[PDB]
Amino acid sequence: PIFLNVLEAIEPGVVCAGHDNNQPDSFAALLSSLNELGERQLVHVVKWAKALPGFRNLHVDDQMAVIQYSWMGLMVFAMGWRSFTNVNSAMLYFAPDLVFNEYRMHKSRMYSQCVRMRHLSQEFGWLQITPQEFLCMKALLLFSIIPVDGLKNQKFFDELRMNYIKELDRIIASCSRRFYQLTKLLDSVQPIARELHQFTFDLLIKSHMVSVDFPEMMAEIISVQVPKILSGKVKPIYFHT
């Protein structure tokens, strides 16, 4: 199975946030650390995406665009899995040095979103999602959000997306109940990503007022790309309507 071999081989390692776990949980410190984690993770997502099968079929402008729209969903899905595997979905395992208990959920001012991410994480346990199903789904999430007006070379994207879907159905193989449930789970990422998009955008707008630090690449992406999503110019591809 050349496909699974490559997915397994490219899967990123452990990324730490550099959070100071000796200081008191404050909003400013937690969110600044989540932003720095987002930045560190983005480096890894770019290297990962560019090593995926087919990914270079895309126009270079589409490659960047698809990353810049999909990172939130990709990260959130990966964090849900780590949470499941490491702490049985009891807490959110953003990183080894940044694990959210309920207290940090509350202090983060993102409690409802954290709760939703926690539900997502319990879904990996409740559905008995296998590591290989996880890997295939995560790869598909890269090809699940695009401009309503299409991409520069949209045909290559449609063919890529078709192939990733085929690969998932294949690792699945009333067996169609399975595909129903995996597709529903993938869809469930998107509303979570949308609320995080709204949260992080509002946080960027008010970042000086609340003393939260955004790194460079996070600030650019959230001011240039994320509003295209929130304004409806760029929209998730749902399986179910």
């Binding site: 490659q63 990353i67 690449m217």
Partner: peptide
């Protein structure tokens, strides 16, 4: 572009 710098 910050992210384009990183992309390439």
């Amino acid at each position: 572009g910050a992210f384009q710098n990183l992309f390439q």
